[PDB]
Amino acid sequence: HWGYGKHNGPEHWHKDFPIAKGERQSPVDIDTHTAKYDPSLKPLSVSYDQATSLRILNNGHAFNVEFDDSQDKAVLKGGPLDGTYRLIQFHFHWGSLDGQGSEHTVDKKKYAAELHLVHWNTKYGDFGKAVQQPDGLAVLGIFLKVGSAKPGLQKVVDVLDSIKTKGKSADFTNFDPRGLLPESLDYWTYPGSLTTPPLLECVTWIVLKEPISVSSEQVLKFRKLNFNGEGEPEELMVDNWRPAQPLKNRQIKASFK
């Protein structure tokens, strides 16, 4: 019964998921001055031209746009990664106000929201096996600021009315995730975890330096979603973010000077 409320939020998760207090938890604050430039880091290869979106789902903590990951259709490679990671889903974390919502922070600065494009390492055969491995997942994190609209986001915003409550899904074919990427692929990278239970320490995080901008109307639509099921008391889906966790024995690396 975990969530983001006063009684079941991030500070409680450790009781069911003791790894919450582990050595490689996410998100973290990215201290830009102490991140180390690593000239051996390769450019990222984001290959989304053949992506096949299938569906959008309200799972009670966020909404997931899911992809066909039964073939190498939309993959991430390069950067800090060895091998090929397949896109399975993306989702967002966002705030009740424009000054909070991101999970990662940059020099303690919070963004309005954060996009997570979740990929799994094909050497493990499926997502459920991958999350059990220290190099199982690669998550591309992209910050959202409020400003101009993002045209490439609008098709997501428009279907949200159909998935207002927990457990609702809708067909969501022919969505191109390239429309959510900033111009630059400069990034920070560190080893971490899923930011929701089960909090498994299986993620190579790749956090892009450059945010995307979305409009006030687009983020407002995110905030009209519900954490609850239809016919249950209405609780707006807002502030579905975990705060920064201790860095512990980790160094954040930068692809750029």
Catalytic residues: 61
Query: Is residue 195 a known part of a binding site?
Result: yes
Nearer to Zn ion, 9 or 38 (CB): 9
Q: List binders of Zn ion among 173-232 (CB under 5 A).
A: 195
8: exposed, middle or buried (Cβ count in 10 Å: 0-12, 13-18, 19+): middle
Q: Which of 24, 104, 110, 116 binds Zn ion (CB under 5 A)?
A: 116
Rounded to an integer, what distance in angstroms lies between the CA atom of residue 165 and that of residue 114? 21
Smallest gap from residue 239 Cβ to Zn ion (A): 14
What is the C-alpha to C-alpha distance for residues 68 and 52, in angstroms, rounded to an integer? 6
- Kindly state the tokens that stand for 116: 């997570």
Between 17 and 38, CB nearer to Zn ion:
17
Q: How far apart are CA 110 and CA 21, in angstroms?
A: 22
Give dist(CA 230, CA 162) in Å, integer.
Answer: 12
Is 84 within any annotated ligand binding site? no
Q: Report the residue number, 110 or 116, with the smaller CB distance to Zn ion.
A: 116
Does 116 carry a binding-site annotation?
Answer: yes
Which residue reads 């998550």 in tokens?
139
Does 104 show up as a binding residue in the annotation?
Answer: no
Minimum CB separation of residue 255 from Zn ion in Å reads: 21
CB of 39 to Zn ion, least distance (A): 29
- Nearby residues of 86 by Cβ (< 8 Å), 6 or more positions away: 69, 72, 73, 74, 75, 119, 120, 122
- Hey, CA dihedral for 153, 159, 163, 169, is it positive or negative? negative
Count of chain residues binding Zn ion (CB under 5 A): 2
Judged by CB under 5 A, the stretch of 77-85, 110-118, 151-159, 164-172 that binds Zn ion is 110-118
- For Zn ion, give the closer residue by CB, 53 or 195: 195
Residue 91 known to bind ligand: yes
- The answer to whether residue 119 forms part of the interface with Zn ion (CB under 5 A) is no
CB of 91: closest distance to Zn ion in angstroms? 6
Q: Which residues bind Zn ion (CB under 5 A)?
A: 116, 195
